[PDB]
Amino acid sequence: NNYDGDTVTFSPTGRLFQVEYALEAIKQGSVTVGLRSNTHAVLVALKRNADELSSYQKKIIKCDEHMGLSLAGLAPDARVLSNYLRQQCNYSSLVFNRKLAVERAGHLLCDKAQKNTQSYGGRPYGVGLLIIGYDKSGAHLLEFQPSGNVTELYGTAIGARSQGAKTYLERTLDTFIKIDGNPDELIKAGVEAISQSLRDESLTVDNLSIAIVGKDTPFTIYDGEAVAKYI
Amino acid sequence: MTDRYSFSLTTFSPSGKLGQIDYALTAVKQGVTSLGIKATNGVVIATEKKSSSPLAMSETLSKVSLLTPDIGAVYSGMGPDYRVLVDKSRKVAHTSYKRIYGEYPPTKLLVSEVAKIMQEATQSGGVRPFGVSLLIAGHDEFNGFSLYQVDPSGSYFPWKATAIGKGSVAAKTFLEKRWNDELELEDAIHIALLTLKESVEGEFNGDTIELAIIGDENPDLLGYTGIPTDKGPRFRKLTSQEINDRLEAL
Amino acid sequence: TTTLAFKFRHGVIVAADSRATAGAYIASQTVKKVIEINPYLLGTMAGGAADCSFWERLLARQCRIYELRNKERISVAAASKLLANMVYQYKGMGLSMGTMICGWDKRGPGLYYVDSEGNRISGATFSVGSGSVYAYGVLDSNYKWDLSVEDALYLGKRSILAAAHRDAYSGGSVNLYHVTEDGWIYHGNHDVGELFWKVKEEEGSFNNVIG
Amino acid sequence: GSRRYDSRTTIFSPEGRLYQVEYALESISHAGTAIGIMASDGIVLAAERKVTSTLLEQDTSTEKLYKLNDKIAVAVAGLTADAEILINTARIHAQNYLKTYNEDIPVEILVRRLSDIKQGYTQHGGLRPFGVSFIYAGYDDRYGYQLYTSNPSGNYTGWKAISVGANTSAAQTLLQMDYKDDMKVDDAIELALKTLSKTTDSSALTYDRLEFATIRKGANDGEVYQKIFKPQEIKDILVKTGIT
Amino acid sequence: DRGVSTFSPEGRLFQVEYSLEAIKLGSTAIGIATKEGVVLGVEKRATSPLLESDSIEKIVEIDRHIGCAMSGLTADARSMIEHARTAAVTHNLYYDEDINVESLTQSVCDLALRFGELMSRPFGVALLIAGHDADDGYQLFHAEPSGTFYRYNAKAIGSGSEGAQAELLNEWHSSLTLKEAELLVLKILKQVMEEKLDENNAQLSCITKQDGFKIYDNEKTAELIKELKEKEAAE
Amino acid sequence: GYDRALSIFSPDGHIFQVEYALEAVKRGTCAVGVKGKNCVVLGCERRSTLKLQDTRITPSKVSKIDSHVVLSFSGLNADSRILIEKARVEAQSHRLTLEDPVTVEYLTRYVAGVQQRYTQSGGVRPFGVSTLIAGFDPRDDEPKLYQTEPSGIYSSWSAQTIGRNSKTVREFLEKNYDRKEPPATVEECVKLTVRSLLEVVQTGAKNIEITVVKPDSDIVALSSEEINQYVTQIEQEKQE
Amino acid sequence: QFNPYGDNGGTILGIAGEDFAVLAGDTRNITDYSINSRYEPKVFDCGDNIVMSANGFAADGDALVKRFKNSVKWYHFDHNDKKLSINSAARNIQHLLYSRRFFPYYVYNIIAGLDEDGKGAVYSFDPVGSYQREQCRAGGAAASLIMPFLDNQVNFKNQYEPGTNGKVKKPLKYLSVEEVIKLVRDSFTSATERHIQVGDGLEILIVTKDGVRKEFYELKRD
Amino acid sequence: MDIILGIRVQDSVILASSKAVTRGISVLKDSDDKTRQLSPHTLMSFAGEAGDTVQFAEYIQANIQLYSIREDYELSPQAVSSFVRQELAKSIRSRRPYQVNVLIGGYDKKKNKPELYQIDYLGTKVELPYGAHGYSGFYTFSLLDHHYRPDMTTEEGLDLLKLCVQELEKRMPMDFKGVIVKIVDKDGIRQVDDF
Numbered sequence A: 001n002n003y004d005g006d007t008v009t010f011s012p013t014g015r016l017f018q019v020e021y022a023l024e025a026i027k028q029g030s031v032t033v034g035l036r037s038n039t040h041a042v043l044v045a046l047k048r049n050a051d052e053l054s055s056y057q058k059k060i061i062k063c064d065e066h067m068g069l070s071l072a073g074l075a076p077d078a079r080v081l082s083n084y085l086r087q088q089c090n091y092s093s094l095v096f097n098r099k100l101a102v103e104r105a106g107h108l109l110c111d112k113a114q115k116n117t118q119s120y121g122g123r124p125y126g127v128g129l130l131i132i133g134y135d136k137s138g139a140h141l142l143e144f145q146p147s148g149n150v151t152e153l154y155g156t157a158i159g160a161r162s163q164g165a166k167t168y169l170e171r172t173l174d175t176f177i178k179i180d181g182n183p184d185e186l187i188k189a190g191v192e193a194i195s196q197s198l199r200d201e202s203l204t205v206d207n208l209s210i211a212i213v214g215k216d217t218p219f220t221i222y223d224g225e226a227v228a229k230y231i
Numbered sequence B: 001m002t003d004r005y006s007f008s009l010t011t012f013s014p015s016g017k018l019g020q021i022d023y024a025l026t027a028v029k030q031g032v033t034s035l036g037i038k039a040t041n042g043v044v045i046a047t048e049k050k051s052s053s054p055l056a057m058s059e060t061l062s063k064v065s066l067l068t069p070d071i072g073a074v075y076s077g078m079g080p081d082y083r084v085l086v087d088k089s090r091k092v093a094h095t096s097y098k099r100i101y102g103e104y105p106p107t108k109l110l111v112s113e114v115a116k117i118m119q120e121a122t123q124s125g126g127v128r129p130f131g132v133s134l135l136i137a138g139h140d141e142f143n144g145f146s147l148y149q150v151d152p153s154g155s156y157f158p159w160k161a162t163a164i165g166k167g168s169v170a171a172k173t174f175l176e177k178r179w180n181d182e183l184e185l186e187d188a189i190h191i192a193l194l195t196l197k198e199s200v201e202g203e204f205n206g207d208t209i210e211l212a213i214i215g216d217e218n219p220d221l222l223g224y225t226g227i228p229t230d231k232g233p234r235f236r237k238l239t240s241q242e243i244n245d246r247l248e249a250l
Numbered sequence C: 001t002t003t004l005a006f007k008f009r010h011g012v013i014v015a016a017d018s019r020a021t022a023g024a025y026i027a028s029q030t031v032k033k034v035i036e037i038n039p040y041l042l043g044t045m046a047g048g049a050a051d052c053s054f055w056e057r058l059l060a061r062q063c064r065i066y067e068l069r070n071k072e073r074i075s076v077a078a079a080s081k082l083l084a085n086m087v088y089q090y091k092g093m094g095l096s097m098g099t100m101i102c103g104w105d106k107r108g109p110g111l112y113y114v115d116s117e118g119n120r121i122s123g124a125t126f127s128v129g130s131g132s133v134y135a136y137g138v139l140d141s142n143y144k145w146d147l148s149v150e151d152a153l154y155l156g157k158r159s160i161l162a163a164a165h166r167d168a169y170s171g172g173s174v175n176l177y178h179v180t181e182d183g184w185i186y187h188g189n190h191d192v193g194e195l196f197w198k199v200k201e202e203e204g205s206f207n208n209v210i211g
Numbered sequence D: 001g002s003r004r005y006d007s008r009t010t011i012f013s014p015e016g017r018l019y020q021v022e023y024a025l026e027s028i029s030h031a032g033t034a035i036g037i038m039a040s041d042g043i044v045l046a047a048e049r050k051v052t053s054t055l056l057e058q059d060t061s062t063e064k065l066y067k068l069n070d071k072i073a074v075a076v077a078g079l080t081a082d083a084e085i086l087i088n089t090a091r092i093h094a095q096n097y098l099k100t101y102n103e104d105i106p107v108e109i110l111v112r113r114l115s116d117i118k119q120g121y122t123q124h125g126g127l128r129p130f131g132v133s134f135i136y137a138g139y140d141d142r143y144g145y146q147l148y149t150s151n152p153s154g155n156y157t158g159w160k161a162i163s164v165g166a167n168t169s170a171a172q173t174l175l176q177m178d179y180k181d182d183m184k185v186d187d188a189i190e191l192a193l194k195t196l197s198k199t200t201d202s203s204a205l206t207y208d209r210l211e212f213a214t215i216r217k218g219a220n221d222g223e224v225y226q227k228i229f230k231p232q233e234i235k236d237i238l239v240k241t242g243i244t
Numbered sequence E: 001d002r003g004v005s006t007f008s009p010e011g012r013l014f015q016v017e018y019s020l021e022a023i024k025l026g027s028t029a030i031g032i033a034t035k036e037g038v039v040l041g042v043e044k045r046a047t048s049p050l051l052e053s054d055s056i057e058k059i060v061e062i063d064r065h066i067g068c069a070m071s072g073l074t075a076d077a078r079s080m081i082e083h084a085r086t087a088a089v090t091h092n093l094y095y096d097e098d099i100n101v102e103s104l105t106q107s108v109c110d111l112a113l114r115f116g117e118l119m120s121r122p123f124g125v126a127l128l129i130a131g132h133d134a135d136d137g138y139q140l141f142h143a144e145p146s147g148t149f150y151r152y153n154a155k156a157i158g159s160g161s162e163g164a165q166a167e168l169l170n171e172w173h174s175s176l177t178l179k180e181a182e183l184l185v186l187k188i189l190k191q192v193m194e195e196k197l198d199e200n201n202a203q204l205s206c207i208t209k210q211d212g213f214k215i216y217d218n219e220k221t222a223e224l225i226k227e228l229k230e231k232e233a234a235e
Numbered sequence F: 001g002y003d004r005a006l007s008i009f010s011p012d013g014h015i016f017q018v019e020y021a022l023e024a025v026k027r028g029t030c031a032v033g034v035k036g037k038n039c040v041v042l043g044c045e046r047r048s049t050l051k052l053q054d055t056r057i058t059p060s061k062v063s064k065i066d067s068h069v070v071l072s073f074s075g076l077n078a079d080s081r082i083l084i085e086k087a088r089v090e091a092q093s094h095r096l097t098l099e100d101p102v103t104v105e106y107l108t109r110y111v112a113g114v115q116q117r118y119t120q121s122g123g124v125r126p127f128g129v130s131t132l133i134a135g136f137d138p139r140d141d142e143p144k145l146y147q148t149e150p151s152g153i154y155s156s157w158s159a160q161t162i163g164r165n166s167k168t169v170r171e172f173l174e175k176n177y178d179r180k181e182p183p184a185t186v187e188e189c190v191k192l193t194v195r196s197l198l199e200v201v202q203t204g205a206k207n208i209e210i211t212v213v214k215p216d217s218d219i220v221a222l223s224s225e226e227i228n229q230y231v232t233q234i235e236q237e238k239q240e
Numbered sequence G: 001q002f003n004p005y006g007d008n009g010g011t012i013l014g015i016a017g018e019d020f021a022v023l024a025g026d027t028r029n030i031t032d033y034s035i036n037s038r039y040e041p042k043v044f045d046c047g048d049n050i051v052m053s054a055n056g057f058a059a060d061g062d063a064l065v066k067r068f069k070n071s072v073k074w075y076h077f078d079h080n081d082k083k084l085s086i087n088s089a090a091r092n093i094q095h096l097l098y099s100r101r102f103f104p105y106y107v108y109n110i111i112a113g114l115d116e117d118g119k120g121a122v123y124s125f126d127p128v129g130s131y132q133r134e135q136c137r138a139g140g141a142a143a144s145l146i147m148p149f150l151d152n153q154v155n156f157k158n159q160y161e162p163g164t165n166g167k168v169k170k171p172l173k174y175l176s177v178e179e180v181i182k183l184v185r186d187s188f189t190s191a192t193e194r195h196i197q198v199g200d201g202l203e204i205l206i207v208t209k210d211g212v213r214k215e216f217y218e219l220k221r222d
Numbered sequence H: 001m002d003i004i005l006g007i008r009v010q011d012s013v014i015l016a017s018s019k020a021v022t023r024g025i026s027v028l029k030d031s032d033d034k035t036r037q038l039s040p041h042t043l044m045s046f047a048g049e050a051g052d053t054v055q056f057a058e059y060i061q062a063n064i065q066l067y068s069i070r071e072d073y074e075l076s077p078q079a080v081s082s083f084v085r086q087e088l089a090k091s092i093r094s095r096r097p098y099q100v101n102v103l104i105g106g107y108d109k110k111k112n113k114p115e116l117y118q119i120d121y122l123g124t125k126v127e128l129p130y131g132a133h134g135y136s137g138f139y140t141f142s143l144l145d146h147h148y149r150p151d152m153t154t155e156e157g158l159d160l161l162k163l164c165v166q167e168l169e170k171r172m173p174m175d176f177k178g179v180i181v182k183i184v185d186k187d188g189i190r191q192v193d194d195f
């Protein structure tokens, strides 16, 4: 109300409204789902178009051979944060000959977003990210909020109508975690999860976007006729 | 962090007034009375030592300050502002003059430098004006004795005699009747003590009054002998006893 | 190196050898010392191969942004001056460049000599490189303004040959170019080994050499 | 943050005026009147000190008329402290020019430089403008005798006769009436004092309430002399013209 | 007042949304992508008859294989075009090749959100970036001040955009020829323009693989206008 | 440094500071530009509220940027000096780096770019100035006349006016100026420029300034008497 | 006084075929008269069907390769996983080298792969970025020993057809991968005999449309 | 570059400058004009290290032309010479000084007098009736000291200049390929096309 003019101002109940408004931009964004087993980790994203003549906005970005994310909200802010991850992953490789741990990647994103919430002049990031990766401790899935909060999960979903997919994963928890050494079945579970967030529209060939990473699987993105198999 | 106040805090209002300067002058009005009188063979500056508490040692607080050996200063308004201005005035006398020309600046030019510092606090970013008016008395070879007033705006004027602060209006009237161009220094000190008694309520003695002069050279205060051309400071602060002696012949 | 260029009635001829050296060792013999900046602008290279290549490629990009902002092809004089000012910043720092900016613009055919020392000179005839001194003899003696394209191409070719023969650090092959108002035209790569014997027989020159 | 307290000194009004410049001009209209008159054989600068006191040391005082170099002088109207900042800059500019070209700075070039500084404070920096209007009186070998004025907007213009400060409307009308092109310095001196005497807010115009100066070729042969009048000399010229 | 980089309660940047309103006031620009090329057309909209219309430059060359049309506060586009031209030529310097249309568009869009308290406000202009490369062929992009860019088969921006976009919805198909696209841009421009469309107040351009980016002459466009009138009168 | 964003968008998609800068131009004295077949004429209004002025030394309204290009303006006078100085520096910088004088179109594009930069830079306000830039390109006999404004947009004009009551004189020019046959001579071009200002000026005495620019750096400013002869002839034909 | 440069020896060789390319180099690393390693790889698969070898001062060579590999990585990120052509890599490497024009990478550098028409390509670089496409090129310590042999046996220089006596040249017939690998091994075996910094081992990387293949052969250890 | 001469006569200033440009053992050009017009009645000749010479002259030219446009007034030769000197005196204590010596010949239209200034790369200025830079003055000053009058005509100044050049051509080991001669007077600057 009077305390939402900038990010440097707490409200009387201890809330940061500019951060909460940035969180709102994620809810307007298109749905994206993340889930993992012990061997693989999968991202599934519903892409959005402007109209029938337009293309479908890309949702998934590769950060390294063993790591990447999906976005929901302001796409340019995802480009900035993913570029930062690309550099950090790259610094770890060049300096330490070491693939960046997914947990440490989350800590770096948290700290970068936090600086934008405590200083005058700047603004919070207006995007939510789902980071997947395979490192020395196996498969991982992270959820990033621009408040700075980063959370490691078995599965999750963000964006519009994401509650439906999140409930499905909460039921299926015991099943999909056991899908080891079977990438196609893990993707099926992800495509079935994101389907719980659909209304009116359905999953078409240029609508769906899938990405996977695992034990002997580099981070690869599937679009177009490559995902017709899963429709 | 960073000082993000890079804009002026003093600005013209629709009527053409610079509000913060006017308000600074109001703070000066609330301040304790101080005055200055120029004689033929000297200048005197004086004020009241308004002690905040009787437990406080008022000797440690110096309202009258030496700027150069031949220039002294007194104020009315906010004390802390005055203290920092004296520090800057003392330094600028060295950096912008003595280190260049090898001699202390004449009164009018030191005044000009102090005025500049006060003007900049009236236009620069993220600062308020100084809440003081200064009275600067001094002597130099080619201009003789002189007395200047400096206001929060940075404007300065030369005076034969004047007063600033609490009871300045009444004090300036008192000085107009008593001042002439044939006054000796002792006569000016006498008039200064008479003028200052009117604005003081409580005790009126050497311990509650601060008074200094710009007069003859004091070779006894120089601290060394051997150089004929160096004859000592013209600035001298009168002692508590020296004031009381002149209060008996009052 | 040996490079040359000269203005004449029907445009400007540009010729150069192809040898690259690292002390006495011939590192390459297939080097293109003529750089195509635009269909109407050529640049020659002599001295530091890396230096000449970098700065003239960077100039070609300056000349292109010029065309985009101004809707007009850059002049030979402006192009030569951009280079000169670029290399002047690094003067005394160690750069080694000897170049000629050849082209056709509104004022007709243009030819400027530019070097790392700071010189920028307009002229009708130039030759730069270790073998330039040998080439000047043939040019100066046979150069006209009323020269046919066929005879002008031969002169520039014969001039490089003269230098390639005598100068130890010049040789390999001759690259020819002819710049017209419709743009430059490449006139082939000519091996000096084969060209020498051909010229010797047809012209009668180099009588001192046996073959 | 800090934005909350920013007055925004360099913005347009909906009518396309600069707020602070207009308010600075309002301030200057309460300052003591200064008049400049240009004649064929010299220039006059006259100015009124503001409500003085009997205890003010006049002979060592200077609030209106300042010397920029040997050929150029200025009359001030507005904040004296602000004016001294600009005056010292102008003195430095004049010396820079002299060092560079080994010739005295042309009047207009000095005026343009100061006016450009004033302009800068109205377009960038977020600082308040200088609340000062100048009358420049000067001589050079190109245009001869010249009068200029500048104001907080940074705009400057040339004049035959001009006034700044208080009562300029009344003063300009009186000057426009009695001024003629073939006028001389002695006549211009009389015109300046008569105009102040009629426009003044004081009861009577006296020597102690005035600052006066002339720029004359009335110097021995082809050269220019600046004369800043002393209190006694102002008293004499007041009697001569028949005001006191 | 309030921050320049402030979010609204709905999760949008105030300034970005306000700049989009400025673009709606701009003159119309239309782009149509085909397999034979991409066509770009604009409304010139001269404010007075004394204004020499040929000096109105709302269609612009970025490189030989990339063109650009603009709509909104056109003065803001100059530094964007400058950056685009520099980016295109710089990539040719570093990699000895033409730059991808998408990569060029991404470079332009990186400038968009570089504003705060960098430039003081977002750009008040939208761009239609059309071009061709070997990887993805003929392409048309719509670059906004939000930093977002969508690829389009056909797109209209400016004052008559939503009316034109609905018309492009019905008319576009994947087998359009270049000549058909030219007439289609002229048709839709004539429909949304206030004044009567002619060769002086409207301008056409295209980008083909062979000839590259070309702005059409007023004599060439005049014939296409005359060809349009006759084919509409044919039924 | 002072970084405050002064020029910003409003809810309706307007930058008020830029629009208020146009209001400053509206207040400024009238300026007019007319190009003939082989010349360009720049006319300027001088407000007669200021008499006792020294016309020798007062800043003239038309400024030479180079020997072949001139610039007139309407709006804040102090602001115009900054643009003119920058334009003059750029003109010499262009001659220095490219060995050719600037084209009129190039100089205009530079000045317009400066104006635009001041509409999206922190801590600065827009220029309250619109300019008319006229001249002839080097080795060219085609007349050039361009206009700029605070937003940064620029364009070429057969004839154009800016400043106060520019709406009236533009109205006059639109009906009197024929594109198929422009003022064939200097006389016809100056006459039309004076006629257009007489719709607005008041008195035809010292209120009208005229500057004629011809090809090959031939620039001259008309005197009071020369202009007065045009004012005389126009009104004598009007009495009919 | 501190000398920031060193000489780690080594020799490399690139040969371009009609539809393939090879990049060979010995595996010996040295300082002065000491051997550091008998097997220290010098030729690398940098991705996108490009092989590279930069050496002389090992530390500068390792850094350049490391930077170019990084350049390939970022080329994919920034241009939609587009394949970096050999001619584009060459130009990129020039700019990596000239960025240190005033504190050079003290190295000889050669890259090899296939051009956009599928034909074999070899590019050669000097320490500050002057590059040339060639058919045959040796670099390093024994470059001067090998190159004349390749002029003769790859380009048939000074070779004429018998009976004509210098009137007709030997025609430029292309070479097979098997014929090329023979010239490579003979080149390095000859260089090992007469150059002290060459020996221990020989690693060859062959590039075809199918990918990148390796071959290793021992050399004399004296 | 090599030889630059200057002589101030009754009503004009004459500047003679060599035509040769040399890179090592080779004469690159034999028709080089080592001069820039700073203003319609002010000419500056120059000589020194390659690049520095032309860069400096053109930099001065740009500054004077800028002044002329800004003020619509031509600076006096004295004012220009003082500006040039300051730039060189500033240059000599810089990281890399301009290695340039100049002669400034101008006609002052106010005083109706020709003026010649000699300035070296250190910023050493001197007004002279005649002057030279480098090894030129060594050969020519004895003739000028002998033959020069301040009331000489332009034609007499040219004849004395021919004599100076003839001596240079006889005793200097270096071939400088003749001189380009230019005259600065009340009517402006012109080149003597036959010398």
Ligand SMILES: *[C@@](C)(CO)[C@](*)(O)[C@H](CC(C)C)NC(=O)[C@H](Cc1ccccc1)NC(=O)[C@H](CC(C)C)NC(=O)[C@H](CCc1ccccc1)NC(=O)CN1CCOCC1
Residues within 6 Å of the ligand: C001, C002, C019, C020, C021, C022, C023, C027, C028, C031, C033, C045, C046, C047, C048, C049, C050, C052, C096, C129, C130, C169, C170, G101, G104, G125, G126, G127, G128, G130
């Ligand atoms: C004629 C042929 C010679 O004068 C021409 O002038 C040609 C011009 C062509 C190539 C454009 N110039 C050369 O051949 C030129 C001569 C030269 C050498 C060094 C400095 C300046 C001029 N040669 C080169 O530029 C070679 C080209 C190579 C062989 C492909 N380059 C080198 O010699 C490099 C570059 C070195 C360098 C320059 C500036 C800063 C740092 C380094 N040097 C090496 O490769 C090291 N060299 C290897 C041989 O053993 C000794 C060390």
Ligand SMILES: [Mg+2]
Residues within 6 Å of the ligand: G191, G192, G193, G194, G195, G196, G197, G198, G199, G220, G222
């Ligand atoms: Mg061995």
